[PDB]
């Protein structure tokens, strides 16, 4: 993803650990990225998450 679009997700990460599915869709639309590139981009940096806490 892009730079930004790496920043903007880590923004909410920040905030959310998880997103809804509706949450999910709408970030989506607005970082122009699709549902399943966001839920997959959560679930990989929950995985960090956990290994670096
Ligand atoms: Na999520």
Do not use: G, H, I
Request: glycine share 0%; proline share 0%; hydrophobic share 40%.
């Amino acid at each position: 993803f892009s730079r930004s679009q790496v920043l903007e997700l880590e923004r909410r990460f920040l905030r959310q650990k998880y997103l809804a599915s509706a949450e999910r869709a709408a970030l989506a639309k607005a970082l122009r990225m699709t549902d399943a590139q966001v839920k997959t981009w959560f679930q990989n940096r929950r995985t960090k998450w956990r290994r670096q806490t």
